[PDB]
């Protein structure tokens with residue numbers, strides 16, 4: 019079998035990879051992508067789309083479940099049933115349509131996609147199931163993997179995200195080790211589907227990265243939903259039919275769980291393929307990269323999760339397309355104004371830009387203003403799930419530094435938050451924009467009116 | 477009873493009125509508001525909040541109704557029941573909380589609110605149930621009323637928006653004369669609640685203000701939903717238990733309906749109170765106003781629906797606050813970049829800024845690009861209801877002139893569309909902003925990438 023020889027070789031075919039490919043095919047750089055498993059990556063096959071699609075079928079099961087009890091809406095139904103086989107078959111069709119479509123556009127722009135795992139040989143060649151492949155620029159987009167707990171190997175009963183996104187039956191009591199977006203999005207969805215759920219988390223609170231003002235609405239819904247919340251506890255074992263966790267000094271807890279879901283973090287995928295043969299500078303578990311996504315070895319490039327830093331899909335998609343353009347001549351440098359973060363928890367949290375905390379750390383004097391959804395008509399049409407919108411701005415020129423929001427159907431305000439920040443808006447431009455009634459985004463205009471000293475509905 | 481004497485007198489206590497009040501109380505102008513009926517106006521009591529809240533309970537009844545038939549989601553329920561008394565009681569609580577809150581803020585900023593109808597005496601005094609009231613600036617915010625059909629007086633069986641927002645029972649077959657947002661939002665909601673529905677409309681198509689590219693998704697859902705659509709027909713009568721409509725030359729149609737809902741338009745409220753005693757220039761059925769919302773009689777001001785022009789709440793709210801600031805000294809002029817329009821139809825249409833049509837009329841050369849939701853992951857998690865996002869930009873400097881979108885849960889993209897337009901964004905700034913995955917607003921970044929020549933998922 020003979021040498022394939024290209025200009026751009028990309029290791030990995032998830033978000034970062036297939037968009038570095040598609041734009042390099044588009045820009046006309048000879049490109050080849052290696053992909054061990056299936057295209058789209060973690061996002062399309064066992065992340066992004068299958069989680070948000072399970073969350074949706076969990077929401078529709080929950081909403082027809084509440085109508086067995088009296089509601090102020092006057093709707094009543096008997097016998098809500100969920101046999102998750104079909105929920106999963108549904109989920110799988112969607113993943114299918116989307117991987118298919120990524121092949122189509124990779125064919126369309128003509129990049130050669132070779133399957134099998136790639137063992138690196140040097141910063142120029144690679145061996146994929148026998149055939150060597152050489153290139154001028156190597157782009158690594160190997161991704162990330164889930165951290166395993168030493169006394170709690172995955173296997174059967176201990177599943178990770180990947181298997182939680184794939185039941186053939188649902189648990190009687192599921193325990194969730196880790197109270198970050200993966201644990202919470204999955205825990206809430208397991209509870210609405212009908213399983214009992216407890217979240218065990220080793221810090222003060224759920225979503226410990228985020229302040230308590232913001233995170234507090236989510237906590238209250240888990241507590242409303244019947245999801246126990248053993249904070250301050252760390253997990254030490256699972257004595258066959260029972261889980262044991264301890265709180266630091268001396269606390270107990272024997273939770274009889276028959277499914278545990280470790281969702282304790284994500285590590286850069288740097289091992290198992292010969293990355294170690296190369297002189298690459300590191301940043302903990304991840305490859306160090308400069309603002310041009312290049313490693314310490316010249317024509318080697320890293321993007322997405324392997325570069326650690328914020329581990330999200332749109333970050334990878336946006337580093338891929340930028341690398342592609344730099345190799346093709348265009349002068350670029352990844353300095354976004356912010357990378358929007360969204361958690362599809364009930365309620366949803368959205369953080370885009372600086373939090374108050376962060377603004378203080380960097381030594382800024384801030385106007386921080388908030389407008390709640392209980393004073394919002396749209397929110398009330400929607401049975402609310404109260405939270406608020408918060409704005410953070412420079413007290414001297416009102417240049418907005420960040421945006422955070424908590425509430426029902428808030429995820430789509432992120433588009434607005436990100437673009438206002440990409441443009442360099444001040445509170446004034448946001449406040450002085452007519453926002454349409456009745457929408458949840460009226461709260462964004464009012465949270466900016468309040469910072470300025472003149473809100474109308476609070 | 478004695479002369480109340482103020483600086484600013486406001487006739488009408490709906491959106492335009494109570495925000496002209498609240499900001500004039502805030503700015504400290506002696507202010508009094510007259511209000512015949514109840515605060516908040518048409519929006520809060522018989523428009524905005526009660527329609528969107530009935531649409532929501534119709535959505536929850538429909539979604540638990542579909543689960544009697546097989547779904548790919550695997551959820552099943554028996555016996556969906558809706559006795560609308562409770563849906564309406566629910567609706568009424570929300571309207572209640574919101575009117576209450578408007579009183580609170582009007583008390584808080586100390587404006588005197590006097591009830592009863594006001595008969596104008598001159599452009600300075602008014603008589604409200606006996607007591608005269610004088611002032612320096614008169615602001616009229618009398619609103620709008622629904623056009624009645626001459627051979628079809630309202631009464632019983634012929635209801636208008638106001639009574640459709642208030643059943644004690646639902647119709648067996650409801651016919652809807654008018655296929656604009658009121659008729660369609662209400663028709664779809666009557667159908668999901670379980671009533672049979674036909675829309676009769678005198679033009680080529682549903683939402684005749686809007687182009688067929690955009691409006692076509694809605695049409696297809698009405699047709700999917702079982703809502704008959706007699707376009708080209710005009711209504712001539714209702715022979716007690718049957719409706720008759722004709723199509724222009726000679727066509728028939730005898731629809732046996734036992735409820736008809738005329739939703740044939742909205743007229744400025746200029747009559748019934750002595751507005752006619754004043755020298756005001758007109759613009760058809762509405763008061764003519766300049767960019768400072770002032771009438772042809774100096775310290776007389778008009779806002780909202782009485783000024784006709786686009787008949788929407790956020791327009792009124794934003795004219796109110798601007799008048800208040802002009803009277804208090806600040807130099808202003810209402811020239812928004814656009815007034816966002818939203819229809820809570822299934823699917824939702826959102827138009828913000830220039831349509832292609834409009835851009836051609838004004839003689840502009842345009843890039844018009846579109847990105848659909850079938851190529852969008854978020855849309856698929858959501859069972860889609862496919863439509864697209866469209867962008868319109870100047871072919872010479874890519875300055876964005878407008879934004880339109882059709883689809884499920886699209887209403888919240890309006891915040892983004894409006895602010896990007898208020899800032900003067902070009903396609904580039906939108907496209908070069910990291911949008912979060914998986915959201916419906918990824919379609920907004922891609923529709924801008926496509927206009928530029930380089931989209932990634934289409």
Ligand SMILES: Cc1cc2nc3c(=O)[nH]c(=O)nc-3n(C[C@@H](O)[C@H](O)[C@H](O)COP(=O)(O)OP(=O)(O)OC[C@H]3O[C@@H](n4cnc5c(N)ncnc54)[C@H](O)[C@@H]3O)c2cc1C
Nearest residue numbers: 030032034054059060061065066136160161322323330331
């Ligand atoms: C449950 C879950 C939910 C998530 N939800 C969200 C979300 O909603 N939004 C968000 O932004 N982020 C979310 N993420 C983020 C996460 O999906 C990443 O952001 C995204 O997958 C990163 O893409 P990447 O470029 O690093 O590659 P990955 O998708 O990790 O894929 C890299 C690919 O490289 C392949 N590979 C690696 N080495 C080789 C080799 N040497 N040879 C051949 N093939 C190889 C792998 O098989 C893999 O498919 C989620 C993650 C999880 C697990």
Ligand SMILES: Cc1cc2nc3c(=O)[nH]c(=O)nc-3n(C[C@@H](O)[C@H](O)[C@H](O)COP(=O)(O)OP(=O)(O)OC[C@H]3O[C@@H](n4cnc5c(N)ncnc54)[C@H](O)[C@@H]3O)c2cc1C
Nearest residue numbers: 488490492512517518519523524594618619780781788789
């Ligand atoms: C069913 C329906 C749905 C709607 N939905 C939307 C929507 O979702 N979004 C949107 O933007 N628009 C919507 N509208 C728009 C519409 O509500 C107007 O935009 C809004 O109500 C306009 O406010 P306004 O200032 O003109 O006053 P109005 O709300 O019309 O109220 C004016 C007030 O003046 C009072 N009044 C008049 N004359 C006197 C007098 N001489 N003395 C004392 N009192 C008097 C009246 O009693 C009235 O309450 C909807 C309308 C309807 C009917």
Ligand SMILES: NC(=O)c1ccc[n+]([C@@H]2O[C@H](COP(=O)([O-])OP(=O)(O)OC[C@H]3O[C@@H](n4cnc5c(N)ncnc54)[C@H](O)[C@@H]3O)[C@@H](O)[C@H]2O)c1
Nearest residue numbers: 196197198199200218219220252253281282283284328329
């Ligand atoms: N790991 C990284 O370097 C990194 C970087 C950026 C973003 N992230 C995000 O993290 C995701 C993977 O995990 P996550 O969503 O849970 O986030 P995470 O890594 O922030 O959270 C893991 C949670 O588990 C908790 N925990 C640890 N050990 C525990 C134990 N033994 N018992 C109980 N609780 C324990 C931790 O305090 C933490 O709250 C990735 O998809 C990515 O989006 C990770």
Ligand SMILES: NC(=O)c1ccc[n+]([C@@H]2O[C@H](COP(=O)([O-])OP(=O)(O)OC[C@H]3O[C@@H](n4cnc5c(N)ncnc54)[C@H](O)[C@@H]3O)[C@@H](O)[C@H]2O)c1
Nearest residue numbers: 654655656657658676677678710711739740741742786787
């Ligand atoms: N009337 C105005 O000057 C004006 C201005 C701006 C916006 N609007 C909006 O219109 C709303 C009120 O009505 P709408 O939503 O139906 O909008 P609309 O006034 O645009 O639509 C009324 C519809 O009924 C149709 N029609 C007229 N007579 C008919 C008949 N006899 N038989 C069958 N069809 C007939 C018309 O073609 C039209 O499509 C207001 O709340 C406002 O938001 C009105």
